[PDB]
Write an enzyme that holds these catalytic residues in place. Structure first.
Site, mmCIF file in Angstrom:
data_model
loop_
_atom_site.group_PDB
_atom_site.id
_atom_site.type_symbol
_atom_site.label_atom_id
_atom_site.label_comp_id
_atom_site.label_asym_id
_atom_site.label_seq_id
_atom_site.Cartn_x
_atom_site.Cartn_y
_atom_site.Cartn_z
ATOM 1 N N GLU A 187 -26.548 23.212 -63.919
ATOM 2 C CA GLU A 187 -26.237 24.622 -64.096
ATOM 3 C C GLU A 187 -27.533 25.354 -64.388
ATOM 4 O O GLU A 187 -28.463 24.792 -64.975
ATOM 5 C CB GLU A 187 -25.242 24.883 -65.241
ATOM 6 C CG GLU A 187 -23.884 24.219 -65.081
ATOM 7 C CD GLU A 187 -23.049 24.799 -63.948
ATOM 8 O OE1 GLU A 187 -23.435 25.833 -63.345
ATOM 9 O OE2 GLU A 187 -21.990 24.198 -63.657
ATOM 10 N N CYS A 219 -21.264 24.639 -61.134
ATOM 11 C CA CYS A 219 -21.631 23.278 -60.674
ATOM 12 C C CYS A 219 -21.953 23.366 -59.212
ATOM 13 O O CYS A 219 -21.287 22.706 -58.385
ATOM 14 C CB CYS A 219 -20.485 22.298 -60.947
ATOM 15 S SG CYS A 219 -19.074 23.353 -61.006
#
EC number: 4.-.-.-
Length: 226
Positions: free
Chosen positions: A104, A1
């Site tokens: 991501e 993240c």
């Protein structure tokens, strides 16, 4: 993240957590407008002090004077509460970083394809954070980290870790100064949102460049065109 979106108005996020009487946060109607939040920038971070919720711009990253690497941006939930480095932050520096979703990059050969991940039920996410108090000093080395958990179910196709996302109810309890680190560990366990609550899709490669901050960055795309 390593990137996420924090794009809506403050009220869009805070309404799920507390009414004005619990806040010490000025009214502001302007959307935050950041579809591509990056480490090393200051991020509006929610925490509780003086029995009210506060929203402070806090450096995303944590690097003490003795730390000789780039600042950390995540802390693993498996170990953060007992870590020599993170235990004091787990006890006294808990916070919430609200967001629309996170990004991501999935490895596809030598190519890396970005994905945007968000709640299927359309709520914002309340990411568990720990950091260096007092947050209001605006430190540029010791700020906050996003707590992480293992990805499971379909999310592992994209990436092996994810932010520890809490329910609105659990996020409110997590921030309270009156609960201990042990109680916070119980909240992290009981209030974590499971992987099947998330949806995701590929997005444009443009999100890789932090100059780009527009709403188009979270739109679904065909991988074949990138």
């Amino acid at each position: 993240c390593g990137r996420f979106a924090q794009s809506q108005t403050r009220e869009d996020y805070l309404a799920l957590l507390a009414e004005d009487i619990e806040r010490d946060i000025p009214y502001d109607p302007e959307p935050i407008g950041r579809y591509n939040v990056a480490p090393g920038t200051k991020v509006l971070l929610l925490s509780e002090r003086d029995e009210h919720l506060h929203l402070d711009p806090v450096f995303w990253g944590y690097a003490p004077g003795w730390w000789d690497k780039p600042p950390l941006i995540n802390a693993r939930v498996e170990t953060a509460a007992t870590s020599r480095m993170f235990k004091p932050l787990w006890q006294h520096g808990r916070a919430i970083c609200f967001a629309d979703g996170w990004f991501e990059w999935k490895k596809e050969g030598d190519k890396k394809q970005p994905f945007f991940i968000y709640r299927a039920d359309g709520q914002p996410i309340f990411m568990a954070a720990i950091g260096s108090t007092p947050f209001e000093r605006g430190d540029e080395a010791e700020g906050f980290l996003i707590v992480t958990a293992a990805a499971d179910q379909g999310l592992v196709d994209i990436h092996d870790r994810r932010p520890l996302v809490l329910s609105p109810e659990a996020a409110r309890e997590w921030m309270r100064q009156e609960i201990s680190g042990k109680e916070a560990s119980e909240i992290a366990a009981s209030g974590c949102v499971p992987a099947n609550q998330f949806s995701w899709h590929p997005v444009s490669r443009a999100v890789g460049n932090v100059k780009n901050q527009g709403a188009e960055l979270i739109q679904p795309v065909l991988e074949v065109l990138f």
